[PDB]
Amino acid sequence: FRMGSISAANAEFCFDVFNELKVQHTNENILYSPLSIIVALAMVYMGARGNTEYQMEKALHFDSIKCGKSVNIHLLFKELLSDITASKANYSLRIANRLYAEKSRPILPIYLKCVKKLYRAGLETVNFKTASDQARQLINSWVEKQTEGQIKDLLVSSSTDLDTTLVLVNAIYFKGMWKTAFNAEDTREMPFHVTKEESKPVQMMCMNNSFNVATLPAEKMKILELPFASGDLSMLVLLPDEVSGLERIEKTINFEKLTEWTNPNTMEKRRVKVYLPQMKIEEKYNLTSVLMALGMTDLFIPSANLTGISSAESLKISQAVHGAFMELSEDGPELEQFRADHPFLFLIKHNPTNTIVYFGRYWSP
């Protein structure tokens, strides 16, 4: 299992991000890709030195797993992304990952070559100094095109100016299809109980088929596995038994607990009557504060050491922005109930590696 340590680092980072993200996104849907974020940061890490590099190594959990000392890590991420990025029939996963760099911060040839070999077309030089607004529009157009129109204005107007030197831009798009097709003649409006007092209407899909499901009364939850019609991704839905059971589960979830709850011992194939809201979600984040709070403070202040990217005097990450879009479309004996009509957590995983590709909270339609 070559990819096992990288999958584990990604999961630990996922829950580190969730713990920070949820502090400032209360009573809100959450959707992000720990994988696309960690790949973006690994690309920057390749050019970081000194304390900046050390902080990233710890915060990305690389301290537990040519182009620098961590070339193997870069090689494993490149291989993993190549697996999951693809357009098959009924499967489209796109990651848009780019570091935009000010013209007057010349890029070291070695970093440019390393990005070409390991991180695709992941680096672009632009004129922020005297064309920061055109640069902004060009960046946002690229993100918008790569996400099939779904992630618009990722870099907002206040975010770039003549002093911008580096912007990390990361977006992920996924559109897949349910394997057990939900028949649209059964989709209908049902109340979603955001709280015991507040309900909102949602288009609710209904399925009745064999599914793997963990039934966990000691944790007061059920975990449903939903395969997709094509690709090697699947969804897990963690549904609290109680209308307001989410908070207790968010306070306790981490990589170790998630592994315990999904152990194959208690995952059982059985007939399930599933109610699930239409899963089409978009979220955008400025992750600068979150990543500083995780320990990568140096990267975002003028004392950043990015001398493996450029020898220029001043250099730092001005903004790190992430946009995530996820959609699953449909196709044209007693049952266990799985009625996801109150807030829940969900994730999309890459089955061959157990890598978390998306992590999210469904709070409200």
Side-chain angles (χ1 to χ4, degrees), residues 1-57 59-65 67-68 70-87 89-102 104-112 114-115 118-119 121-128 130-178 181 184 187-195 198-246 249-250 252-255 258-262 264-267 270-272 274-312 315-365:
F1 195 10
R2 303 187 288 98
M3 231 104 59
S5 48
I6 222 104
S7 176
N10 178 74
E12 291 163 347
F13 179 72
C14 180
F15 290 104
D16 292 347
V17 170
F18 186 59
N19 233 261
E20 299 288 349
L21 263 185
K22 70 190 218 293
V23 177
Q24 38 174 213
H25 296 284
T26 63
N27 294 343
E28 195 182 352
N29 296 344
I30 290 173
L31 179 77
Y32 65 96
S33 175
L35 178 60
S36 77
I37 296 164
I38 206 178
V39 174
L41 290 169
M43 185 182 70
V44 173
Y45 170 71
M46 183 164 68
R49 301 293 185 266
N51 283 309
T52 298
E53 181 182 31
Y54 180 77
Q55 292 181 341
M56 298 182 78
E57 179 184 2
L60 305 178
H61 296 275
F62 292 171
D63 54 335
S64 56
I65 79 191
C67 287
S70 309
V71 70
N72 285 343
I73 297 178
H74 303 305
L75 282 172
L76 289 164
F77 275 122
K78 174 183 165 78
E79 151 186 357
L80 184 61
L81 284 200
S82 180
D83 295 344
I84 79 173
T85 65
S87 305
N90 307 318
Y91 177 98
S92 304
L93 191 158
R94 315 174 59 90
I95 288 165
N97 179 62
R98 270 194 189 154
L99 184 67
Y100 286 85
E102 150 68 15
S104 61
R105 306 323 202 258
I107 305 288
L108 293 176
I110 182 55
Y111 187 72
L112 183 60
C114 287
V115 170
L118 298 165
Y119 289 98
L123 177 73
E124 178 161 331
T125 293
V126 290
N127 173 18
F128 290 120
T130 67
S132 58
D133 197 50
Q134 297 103 309
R136 187 175 71 87
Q137 282 294 76
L138 288 163
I139 295 165
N140 282 341
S141 292
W142 176 72
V143 170
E144 181 175 349
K145 180 271 188 298
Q146 292 295 329
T147 59
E148 309 293 328
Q150 297 289 358
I151 307 286
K152 308 188 177 171
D153 194 38
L154 182 60
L155 270 180
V156 310
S157 53
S158 60
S159 71
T160 65
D161 61 17
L162 96 173
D163 296 326
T164 299
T165 54
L166 297 171
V167 179
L168 183 57
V169 178
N170 184 259
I172 184 164
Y173 169 97
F174 174 61
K175 185 171 179 172
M177 191 170 297
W178 296 118
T187 304
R188 66 204 173 89
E189 182 182 277
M190 298 186 4
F192 191 88
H193 301 290
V194 182
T195 66
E198 172 204 356
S199 87
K200 286 190 61 171
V202 72
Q203 288 294 304
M204 186 78 77
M205 311 179 289
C206 169
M207 315 164 188
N208 196 348
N209 213 319
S210 186
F211 296 99
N212 285 312
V213 57
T215 303
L216 302 177
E219 290 77 23
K220 294 175 171 178
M221 82 175 76
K222 293 161 183 184
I223 301 179
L224 178 68
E225 301 187 343
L226 298 98
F228 299 158
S230 75
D232 293 322
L233 308 182
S234 66
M235 183 178 288
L236 300 181
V237 182
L238 297 81
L239 179 64
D241 288 350
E242 306 164 321
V243 164
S244 294
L246 182 61
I249 287 152
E250 287 190 346
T252 192
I253 193 172
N254 59 39
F255 180 38
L258 178 64
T259 300
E260 293 174 6
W261 300 339
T262 53
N265 284 9
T266 53
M267 198 53 72
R270 60 207 279 193
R271 201 157 184 220
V272 186
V274 178
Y275 296 88
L276 193 66
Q278 172 188 357
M279 297 295 286
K280 182 183 186 176
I281 299 167
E282 185 237 7
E283 299 295 336
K284 296 178 275 178
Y285 302 96
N286 185 326
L287 292 171
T288 304
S289 291
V290 161
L291 301 172
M292 293 177 75
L294 288 180
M296 292 174 283
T297 56
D298 293 357
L299 192 58
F300 301 97
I301 55 176
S303 52
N305 186 339
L306 297 174
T307 58
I309 299 185
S310 182
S311 316
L315 193 65
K316 77 185 192 192
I317 299 302
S318 308
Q319 316 285 356
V321 290
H322 177 61
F325 173 89
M326 175 196 72
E327 180 175 4
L328 280 302
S329 68
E330 307 165 355
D331 318 45
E334 93 165 25
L335 331 310
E336 182 172 8
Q337 277 276 123
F338 191 94
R339 185 186 294 257
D341 68 349
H342 59 261
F344 58 89
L345 301 176
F346 62 88
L347 61 88
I348 290 180
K349 61 167 197 173
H350 180 246
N351 298 338
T353 63
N354 293 307
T355 303
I356 300 171
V357 181
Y358 286 82
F359 190 84
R361 178 170 69 202
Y362 192 101
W363 178 253
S364 176

